């Protein structure tokens, strides 16, 4: 069966770890270590195909060494996460996209924009502005809540579909 290498990126505290644990283990984790970077495997069924997901949950200070660049190049798809109550994390999206485009040496990288913490009453990033941004990038936009599990499967599943469309080219 096919293996899909997914990388979860985004600013500090947007919910990278919460979304990953939620997908892999079907439970919400409130206090996951903000500095631990790790990978997780899960056999899933997307559409009709049984496939294995290998998800790298990124953390820690950014490092632009040849090694870390070669390591990120390995990723087939990128989950670009911001929190809908953090404007700065939404503006940090550009920079993640540019680093992904650079290491992949392509303008066509499977990618999904994720607006996390949709359950929160505080919202500083409107849905239409994030939708407009993903439209200029030509990528899907999925709103999520790692707390309520809203859109979690949709976010990772859409990314796999994005890798599938890329491979068949
Ligand atoms: N209300 C709410 N809090 C969330 C959500 N996802 C994560 N959090 C909280 O946001 C904080 C940072 O989340 P975390 O997974 O560590 O993010 P990371 O630094 O991006 O890996 C923690 O207090 C989480 O419990 C969500 O969807 N809703
Ligand atoms: C994790 C992230 C910031 C996002 C994905 C593209 C690249 S390439 C590189 N050396 C990185 C680091 N550190 C990254
Ligand atoms: Mg984390």
Curated annotation (Swiss-Prot):
Question: What start and end residues bound the annotated signal peptide?
Answer: none
Per UniProt, the keywords (alphabetical) are:
Acetylation, Cardiomyopathy, Cell membrane, Cytoplasm, Deafness, Disease variant, Ectodermal dysplasia, Glycoprotein, GTP-binding, Hydrolase, Intellectual disability, Isopeptide bond, Lipoprotein, Membrane, Methylation, Nucleotide-binding, Palmitate, Prenylation, Proto-oncogene, Ubl conjugation
Give the linked disease: Leukemia, acute myelogenous: A subtype of acute leukemia, a cancer of the white blood cells. AML is a malignant disease of bone marrow characterized by maturational arrest of hematopoietic precursors at an early stage of development. Clonal expansion of myeloid blasts occurs in bone marrow, blood, and other tissue. Myelogenous leukemias develop from changes in cells that normally produce neutrophils, basophils, eosinophils and monocytes. Leukemia, juvenile myelomonocytic: An aggressive pediatric myelodysplastic syndrome/myeloproliferative disorder characterized by malignant transformation in the hematopoietic stem cell compartment with proliferation of differentiated progeny. Patients have splenomegaly, enlarged lymph nodes, rashes, and hemorrhages.
Q: Which terms under GO biological process does the entry name?
A: actin cytoskeleton organization; cardiac muscle cell proliferation; cytokine-mediated signaling pathway; epithelial tube branching involved in lung morphogenesis; female pregnancy; forebrain astrocyte development; gene expression; glial cell proliferation
Molecular function terms, GO-annotated: G protein activity; GDP binding; GMP binding; GTP binding; GTPase activity; identical protein binding; LRR domain binding; protein-containing complex binding
SUPFAM superfamilies for this protein? P-loop containing nucleoside triphosphate hydrolases
Q: How is it modified after translation?
A: Acetylation at Lys-104 prevents interaction with guanine nucleotide exchange factors (GEFs).
* Glycan attachment positions: 35
Record-listed N-acetylthreonine modification sites:
2
Q: What is its EC number?
A: 3.6.5.2
According to UniProt, the name of this protein is GTPase KRas
Entry keyword Nuclease = no
Q: Which organism is it from?
A: Homo sapiens
Q: Where in the sequence is N6-acetyllysine found?
A: 104
As recorded in Swiss-Prot or TrEMBL, the protein's gene is named KRAS
Q: Which PROSITE patterns match?
A: RAS
Tree of life domain: Eukaryota
């Amino acid at each position: 069966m096919t293996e899909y290498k997914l990388v979860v990126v985004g600013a500090c505290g947007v919910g990278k770890s919460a979304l990953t644990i939620q997908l892999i283990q079907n439970h919400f984790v409130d206090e996951y270590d903000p500095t631990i970077e790790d990978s997780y495997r899960k056999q899933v069924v997307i559409d009709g195909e049984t496939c294995l997901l290998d998800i790298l949950d990124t953390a820690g200070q950014e490092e632009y060494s040849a090694m870390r660049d070669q390591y990120m190049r390995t990723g087939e798809g990128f989950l670009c996460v911001f929190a809908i109550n953090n404007t700065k994390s939404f503006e940090d999206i550009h920079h993640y996209r540019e680093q992904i485009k650079r290491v992949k040496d392509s303008e066509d990288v499977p990618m999904v924009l994720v607006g996390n913490k949709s359950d929160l009453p505080s919202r500083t990033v409107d849905t239409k502005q994030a939708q407009d941004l993903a439209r200029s990038y030509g990528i899907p936009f999925i709103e999520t809540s790692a707390k309520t599990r809203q859109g979690v499967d949709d976010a990772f599943y859409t990314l796999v579909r994005e890798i599938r469309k890329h491979k068949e080219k």
